[PDB]
Amino acid sequence: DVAIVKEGWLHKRGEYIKTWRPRYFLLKNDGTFIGYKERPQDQREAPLNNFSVAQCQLMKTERPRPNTFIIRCLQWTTVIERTFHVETPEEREEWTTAIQTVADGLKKQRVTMNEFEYLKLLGKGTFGKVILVKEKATGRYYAMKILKKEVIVAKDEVAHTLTENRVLQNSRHPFLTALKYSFQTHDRLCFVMEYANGGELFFHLSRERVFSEDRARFYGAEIVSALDYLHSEKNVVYRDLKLENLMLDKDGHIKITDFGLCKEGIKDGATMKTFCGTPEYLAPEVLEDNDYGRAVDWWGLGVVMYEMMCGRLPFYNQDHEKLFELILMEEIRFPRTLGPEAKSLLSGLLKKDPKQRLGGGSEDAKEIMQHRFFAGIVWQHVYEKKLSPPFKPQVTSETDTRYFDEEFTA
Ligand SMILES: *CCC(=O)Nc1ccc2c(c1)n(C1CCN(Cc3ccc(-c4nc5cc[nH]c(=O)c5cc4-c4ccccc4)cc3)CC1)c(=O)n2C
């Protein structure tokens, strides 16, 4: 019964390269709102929540451009926005009503700040901030997302239900940073995420310069297990897989972080173009604001695992316009000290075309789990943490502060 409600050409502002791009968007009755470079010829795959307009607020703005409408959604613990533009105000009204109608159709179905000690600002965003905190009672480390309540819910009662549910709805996968607490103030919504104390993966990789293929296989296997979970259970694309979002716990297992917030990019002055963060890890289809899916995360896996085994980023250049081209056009090269199994995996994961990318098919993660690089790996044992970590972080417990002291200056 899944059908198209409305379709046509729109102008979508880039999510990382913030410029207006002509896209053909499809609005469906299941809530999906997806744009393409060209209107597609053709479904069988399960829908992705990244494109859902369910439980979202629509806003009509004349800034930065007239006839602009925005779809703002809270997805898990991050407030995201998709900005669109049409030619006439009448055309905007038709889209907004349609989207709202679909969203309405899907509608039908004590922790306080005093308990935490402020430690350090982790990041700032448009709709809030993320800080490193320590629960006074236990001494545990947490990342607290502090978001503006206005941009999320209009009622305190609905926000309270959101706080209760997010904790219960919390996915229990060993390699994802769990949402531990959720509470609200008078004007702020707070998400308390667990913070690994085993050190950043960029820190560990920087010190030992390069990981062995065995050690990279371990980390890679745990990442695959996590991504498989998000895709098949939560039906969501992570889209943030990079070295900076990987940490180790006290035992040496991978933790994929959820500490990010949506920001306004930094204007460079180079043709006055705004860029959001750094693009070295971005998948080609994402960089071009094209249609994207689960294959994005496998590109991310390729990027991460490339750097672990090679000791450098797959694509790098000081100029962004050149860096874009390397990501979009240049073939990936490998060191001659890299084994054939590793090269096969990396080349497959770093395919330019997501439809041809390893794990890009309908079988998703299973295509990667069956790859010869992960031969011998018992994937049930990976999820159950039966695999012993090749590196044991120098910490006595979960409250050990070594990777929070002047030891990481090295
Ligand atoms: C340039 C800065 C910026 O913000 N750019 C930008 C622009 C537009 C965006 C952006 C970003 N995003 C982000 C894409 C990355 N995701 C990361 C993320 C994905 C998924 C989860 C997550 N979701 C869950 C949903 C439901 N149940 C769950 O259990 C979930 C668990 C997780 C999770 C994943 C890893 C670790 C812990 C939990 C979290 C983060 C954030 C938004 C974007 O969407 N748009 C449009």
Swiss-Prot record:
Residues recorded as bearing Phosphotyrosine in the entry: 142
EC number assigned by the record: 2.7.11.1
Residue intervals of the PH domain: 3-104
First-listed, main subcellular location of the protein, grouped into a coarse class: cytoplasm
Residues the record marks as active site: 240
GO biological process, any: maintenance of protein location in mitochondrion
Family, similarity comment: Belongs to the protein kinase superfamily. AGC Ser/Thr protein kinase family. RAC subfamily.
Name this polypeptide is given: RAC-alpha serine/threonine-protein kinase
The species this protein was found in: Homo sapiens
